[PDB]
Amino acid sequence: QMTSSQKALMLELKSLQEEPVEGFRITLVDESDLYNWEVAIFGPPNTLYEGGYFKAHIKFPIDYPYSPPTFRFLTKMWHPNIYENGDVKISILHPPVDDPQSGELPSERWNPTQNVRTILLSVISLLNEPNTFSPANVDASVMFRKWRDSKGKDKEYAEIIRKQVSATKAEAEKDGVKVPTTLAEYCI
Amino acid sequence: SHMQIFVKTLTGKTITLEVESSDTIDNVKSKIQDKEGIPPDQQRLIFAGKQLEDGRTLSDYNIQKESTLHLVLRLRGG
Ligand SMILES: COCC(=O)N[C@@H](Cc1ccc(-c2cc(Cl)cc(Cl)c2)cc1)[C@H](O)[C@@H](O)C(=O)O
């Protein structure tokens, strides 16, 4: 009675709830709807995001995993690699282009062997490593570059990170979540 | 200072590496190239949410015996 995409989603959900990616907690937005997942994301210790509690939604198409999901932060994140609408800018969330001149590898575009665990690890990489040559958010990219070039003396970018981390405290308290602040707590 | 660490790949395999706590990330990436063929500048190693920087050491990140790292490839195209 479950469709092929429902069966695929059930398998991935079970895997990510029983063997989670550290710092990521996965649940269904609606109990009966396998196609919309809530992702709660802790800022890692020993980063400027430490103490943050961020939320994204993953929305899956009717034909998953033959087509990619979307991955969108609900409250927006000011970051060179995140679009202002909340979408993360990752090549794997789009189908292959079937152009031998493009030089793209299969691992860089969506295919039915890709999965949510790979998306989450890609999101960690994207958060760690701004691409200022091809930014999703130009104004955040320009600000990040000024912050990096000034060795933090132009504090604006870090001030925005601090403000966006602080804004998550109310949501954490509502969910009764204690954000980890040490390596031991994050890796539990 | 010798220890074993585990490197999880996107294909679902675990690489067990023999390392020293004083080894640089560069040294670890060289070992991964020898085992998997992936050029070091394309490798990204993740530990507790952080991508590890080439010139630092495992001990700089408090990576201890039997730690698990995640290997991904650098994201292309932005
Ligand atoms: C931008 O500069 C501030 C900053 O904290 N940069 C970190 C990168 C970084 C690491 C993790 C995330 C990250 C990871 C996850 Cl899984 C979630 C979130 Cl919200 C952020 C973002 C950046 C660096 O590792 C920094 O600690 C450092 O030690 O050099």
Residue numbers in the entry:
A (entry chain A): 5 to 192
B (entry chain E): -1 to 76
The study reports:
As an E2, Cdc34 is the central player in a cascade of enzymes that includes an E1 ubiquitin activating enzyme, Uba1, and a large family of Skp-Cullin-F-box (SCF) E3 ubiquitin ligases that function in tandem to assemble Lys48-linked Ub chains on proteins to target them for proteasomal degradation. Uba1 is a multidomain enzyme that serves as the gatekeeper of the Ub conjugation cascade by activating Ub in a two-step process involving adenylation and thioester bond formation followed by transfer of Ub to E2s in a process termed E1-E2 thioester transfer or transthiolation. Additionally, Cdc34 contains unique structural features that are crucial for efficient polyUb chain extension through poorly understood mechanisms, including an acidic loop insertion proximal to the active site and a long C-terminal extension. To better understand the molecular bases of Cdc34 activities, we here determine crystal structures of Cdc34 alone and in complex with Uba1, as well as a Cdc34~Ub mimetic that represents the product of E1-E2 thioester transfer.
To elucidate the mechanism by which CTDprox enhances Cdc34 activity, a crystal structure of a Cdc34~Ub(t) complex that includes a complete CTDprox is needed. To overcome the inherent instability of the Cdc34~Ub thioester bond, a human Cdc34BΔdist~Ub mimetic (Cdc34-Ub, where - indicates an isopeptide linkage) was produced wherein a stable isopeptide bond between Cdc34 active site Cys→Lys mutant and the Ub(t) C-terminal glycine replaces the labile thioester bond, using a modification of a previously described protocol. Analysis of the overall Cdc34-Ub structure shows that, as anticipated, the complex adopts the closed conformation with Ub(t) engaging the crossover helix (hB) of Cdc34. The Cdc34 acidic loop insertion is ordered in this structure, but aside from contacts to Arg74, it does not extensively interact with Ub(t) and is likely ordered due to crystal contacts. Additionally, the C-terminus of Ub is completely ordered through the isopeptide bond with Cdc34 Lys93. Detailed analysis of the Cdc34-Ub structure reveals that CTDprox engages in an extensive network of intramolecular interactions with the backside of Cdc34 that is known to bind non-covalent Ub to allosterically enhance activity in a subset of E2s59. The intramolecular interactions between Cdc34 CTDprox and the backside of the Cdc34 core guide the CTDprox toward the closed Ub(t) where intermolecular interactions occur. These interactions involve a short α-helix (hE) in the additionally ordered region of CTDprox. Tyr190 of Cdc34 CTDprox inserts into a composite pocket formed by residues from both Ub(t) and the Cdc34 core. Additionally, CTDprox Cys191 contacts Ub(t) Ala46, while CTDprox Leu187 contacts Ub(t) Phe45 and Ala46 and participates in longer-range contacts to Ub(t) Tyr59 and Asn60 (right).
